[PDB]
Amino acid sequence: SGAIYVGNYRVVNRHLATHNDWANLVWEDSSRDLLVSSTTAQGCDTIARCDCQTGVYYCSSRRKHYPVSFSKPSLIFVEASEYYPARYQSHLMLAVGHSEPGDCGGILRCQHGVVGIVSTGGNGLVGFADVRDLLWLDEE
Ligand SMILES: Cc1nn(C)c2cc(C(=O)NCCc3cocn3)ccc12
Ligand SMILES: [Zn+2]
Numbered sequence: 001s002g003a004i005y006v007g008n009y010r011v012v013n014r015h016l017a018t019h020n021d022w023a024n025l026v027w028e029d030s031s032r033d034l035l036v037s038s039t040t041a042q043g044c045d046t047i048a049r050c051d052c053q054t055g056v057y058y059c060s061s062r063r064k065h066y067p068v069s070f071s072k073p074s075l076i077f078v079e080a081s082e083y084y085p086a087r088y089q090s091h092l093m094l095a096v097g098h099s100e101p102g103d104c105g106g107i108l109r110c111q112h113g114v115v116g117i118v119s120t121g122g123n124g125l126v127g128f129a130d131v132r133d134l135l136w137l138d139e140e
Contacts, residue, residue: 001060001102001104001105002058002104002106002118003117004043004045004107004117005043005044006045006046006137006138007042008038008040008041008042008043009026009037009038009039009043010037010039011034011035011117011131011134011137012035012036012117013034013105013117013129014029014030014032014035015083015084015104016104016105017035017037020037021035021037025037026038029090030084031088031089031090032091032092033089033120036137045114046112046114047113047114047132047134047137047138048109048112048114048115049113049132049138050132052112052115053071054068054069054070054110055067055068055109055110055115056068057095057097057126057128058106059097059098059099059103059118059126060102061099061100061103062098066097066098068095068096068097069095070094070095070108070115070128071093071095072093073091073092073130074090074091074092075088075089075092076088077089078092078127079122081101081120089129091130092119092128092129093127093130094128095126096125096126097124097125098124098126099118099126099127103118104117104119108128114131115128115132116128116131
């Protein structure tokens with residue numbers, strides 16, 4: 001589990017969104033496994049605006065924050081899970097590291113701020129949904 005709180009927005013994995021998130025939906029994209037909902041209170045997170053390929057992510061199944069190198073956001077084939085059939089997931093970044101389904105929502109961060117959240121994994125690779133291209137998260 002996990003979310004990003006920036007301005008009056010809440011960014012979560014689309015497969016873990018709650019009924020309140022869907023009722024207060026701002027934007028969602030199934031191919032990215034992301035959903036953004038509106039909030040009443042202001043968040044404190046800063047979204048990175050950069051092309052970094054190094055950072056640190058939180059892995060709940062190890063209670064550890066791991067420094068990693070990661071790929072640039074791309075369209076990658078992802079095997080079936082309990083939440084989606086096998087399909088191409090867009091805006092996905094991979095790193096060599098440990099992850100389990102319940103690690104979804106763990107934040108990847110660089111020196112500039114939040115880069116993305118854990119979404120996929122397997123074979124010793126962890127996949128993160130990028131949010132750096134969602135420029136509108138910084139305004140209004
Ligand atoms: C080993 C592993 N690490 N991680 C973080 C996983 C995540 C899943 C998973 O169910 N994700 C749901 C969202 C989703 C995107 O694409 C398909 N399904 C499955 C296996 C792993
Ligand atoms: Zn950065």
